Amino acid sequence: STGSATTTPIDSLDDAYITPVQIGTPAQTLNLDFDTGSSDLWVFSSETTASEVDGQTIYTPSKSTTAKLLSGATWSISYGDGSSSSGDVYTDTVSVGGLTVTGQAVESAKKVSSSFTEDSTIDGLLGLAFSTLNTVSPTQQKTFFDNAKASLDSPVFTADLGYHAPGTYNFGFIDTTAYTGSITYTAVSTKQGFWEWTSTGYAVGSGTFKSTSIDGIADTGTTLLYLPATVVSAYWAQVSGAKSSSSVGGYVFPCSATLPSFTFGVGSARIVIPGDYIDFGPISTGSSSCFGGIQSSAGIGINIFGDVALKAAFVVFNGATTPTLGFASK
Numbered sequence: 001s002t003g004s005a006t007t008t009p010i011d012s013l014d015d016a017y018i019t020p021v022q023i024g025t026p027a028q029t030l031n032l033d034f035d036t037g038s039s040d041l042w043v044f045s046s047e048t049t050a051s052e053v054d055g056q057t058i059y060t061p062s063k064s065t066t067a068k069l070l071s072g073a074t075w076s077i078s079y080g081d082g083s084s085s086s087g088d089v090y091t092d093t094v095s096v097g098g099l100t101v102t103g104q105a106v107e108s109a110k111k112v113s114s115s116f117t118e119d120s121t122i123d124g125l126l127g128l129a130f131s132t133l134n135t136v137s138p139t140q141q142k143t144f145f146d147n148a149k150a151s152l153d154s155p156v157f158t159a160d161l162g163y164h165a166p167g168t169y170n171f172g173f174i175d176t177t178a179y180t181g182s183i184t185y186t187a188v189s190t191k192q193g194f195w196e197w198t199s200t201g202y203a204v205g206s207g208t209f210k211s212t213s214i215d216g217i218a219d220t221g222t223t224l225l226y227l228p229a230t231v232v233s234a235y236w237a238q239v240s241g242a243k244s245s246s247s248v249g250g251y252v253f254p255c256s257a258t259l260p261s262f263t264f265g266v267g268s269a270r271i272v273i274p275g276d277y278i279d280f281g282p283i284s285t286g287s288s289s290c291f292g293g294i295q296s297s298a299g300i301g302i303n304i305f306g307d308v309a310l311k312a313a314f315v316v317f318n319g320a321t322t323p324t325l326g327f328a329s330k
């Protein structure tokens, strides 16, 4: 079997992407953020504290004939940006673009932190990292991808994110018309539970490529590209007037400046991120200072190839016995 669904940016900056997901019988459609950096499928629900819901579509397990309370199971997640959510667990039928999984753990949120409440367009998250990161206690649960794996024609999912435009998430097959040239595959380490890989270097604009190993994670749930301080400093040194601002919390640049492109290595292949993709607009309404899409990972502890980098490529997440990541130009 296969699945194919369209993903759409939530705003004009591509801060996040939402993909419609059908949960329960009869179907309840919720717009979820597909996150390859986490492993919990959690949603806003009829059980969420009324004051913490601001416009989201909620899942109502009492209206689903296939919903089952997973007696005594609880979940609690604390994301990298200080955001958190927690609640109880149900099992229910979940479908993504025609691909159906029965008995998928659906984590019903009882409490959500304010940053989730503020994003009215995001109804929950669909975790696509490895199942060892799932927070369900006392019995850890499998991701949607892990549950679908046996049924898929091929144990892969692909991410084709658009720049200020809709894109596609495909499950079970590789669309050979969605990319140009060939796909370069690279090794994945699953030790921390992430799609962790090693980039072979980088270039700023039309400069010389610097061969250096950069260990990072392919993360669809992170908006920006977080790289070591040395790399980020070399990029922003090429932008007149760019500087690191502690009040803003990162590198900012004059909105009138033209940004150079950024190249990252995947084996012997090169993926070019156009400079326009690194512009995240004014820091505040009316400001002539703009926020950069390439930031330091020094305070994070891990390098993250977020939406800024992934949207410049066709990306294959190969969940075979020995997992790999594929990258192609598009």
Ligand SMILES: c1cnc2c(c1)ccc1cccnc12
Binding pocket: 013, 015, 223, 224, 248, 280, 282, 283, 284, 291
């Ligand atoms: C991810 C993280 N921080 C940001 C954005 C996206 C977009 C705009 C912005 C403006 C000021 C400060 N941070 C951000």
